Design a protein around this ligand. Structure first.
Ligand code: 2RG
Length: 264
């Protein structure tokens, strides 16, 4: 296929997960363009996802530039996935053409599902259905609760600073904070993490004390950092919070399948 010259600006796709990565059973395919896409159908038609074993899936647009593809249920462990974004020279609407093709391979690892149950204040990690860790946890206080729902594991940090001023509450104020945190596994774009919380170890398993993050012991947070990977699942249940938004960025599985497949 040849490129067509156009006075309108080209757009380049970017695919996640990373080429050659092993990811968990919750990882969606993500195709993010550096422009808004006027002809979403043309973009979807140009994206060929092949799986082994073969499984059906569907596209859903997270916003005007980024489309997600996933099956109805979590991936089968061991599945190999090929993503062919064949957008080179494709008219994506209003004179905007794909700048290039992109392709990636990724594979699905073990099924890793960690369930945080507010009724028990325990985060239980299951690997292919078997409990391997039972972690006392302290979730968000009643006034700043942890949302229920299915969270996809994202990035991880050996050390990071959590600072209330980044959302508009000064550190110096009564409810502000600036906190050095170890072993932080991100599970929502809204900023929810599983992380080390030495200051709440006595509350873990008993009382919710956090701003919404899942506090666990230093040892358990490091285990989680070492053994839980991008695309693994954290499910929160029975809190007094609401539900994680489906368009959070890592909240894809909270959209019911009929709404996901209906697309947008
Ligand atoms: C884990 O705890 C994690 C963060 N911490 C959070 C927190 O401190 O609340 C949440 S993010 C949460 C989402 N909305 C609020 C917010 O924006 N509050 C607020 C209050 C006063 C003024 C304003 C404003 O002017 O915009 C906003 C914050 C999440 C679980 C890590 C990062 O600590």
């Amino acid at each position: 296929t040849f490129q067509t010259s156009s006075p309108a600006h080209l757009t380049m796709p970017y695919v996640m997960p990373g080429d050659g990565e092993v990811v968990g059973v919750g990882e969606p395919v993500a195709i993010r363009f550096d422009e808004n896409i006027a002809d979403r159908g043309a973009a979807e038609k140009a994206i060929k996802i092949t799986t082994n074993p073969p499984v059906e899936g569907a596209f859903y647009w997270l916003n005007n530039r980024e489309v997600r593809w996933r099956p109805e249920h979590f991936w089968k462990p061991g599945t190999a996935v090929d993503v062919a974004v064949n957008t080179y020279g494709v008219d994506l609407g209003e004179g905007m053409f794909g700048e290039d093709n992109v392709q990636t391979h990724f594979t699905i690892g073990d099924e890793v599902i960690a369930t945080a149950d507010d009724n028990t204040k325990i985060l239980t990690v299951r690997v292919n259905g078997e409990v391997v860790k039972s972690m006392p946890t302290s979730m968000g206080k009643d006034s700043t609760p942890t949302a229920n729902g299915i969270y996809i594991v994202g990035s991880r940090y050996k050390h990071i600073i959590m600072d209330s001023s980044t959302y508009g509450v000064p550190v110096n104020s009564p409810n502000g904070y600036r906190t050095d945190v170890d072993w932080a596994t991100q599970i929502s774009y809204s900023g929810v993490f599983v992380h080390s919380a030495p200051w709440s170890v006595g509350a873990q398993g008993h009382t919710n004390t956090s701003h919404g993050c899942l506090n666990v012991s230093p040892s358990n947070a490091q285990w989680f950092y070492d053994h839980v990977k991008r695309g693994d699942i954290v499910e929160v249940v029975n809190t007094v919070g609401g539900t994680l938004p489906g368009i959070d960025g890592l909240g894809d599985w909270n959209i019911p399948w009929d709404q996901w497949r209906a697309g947008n």
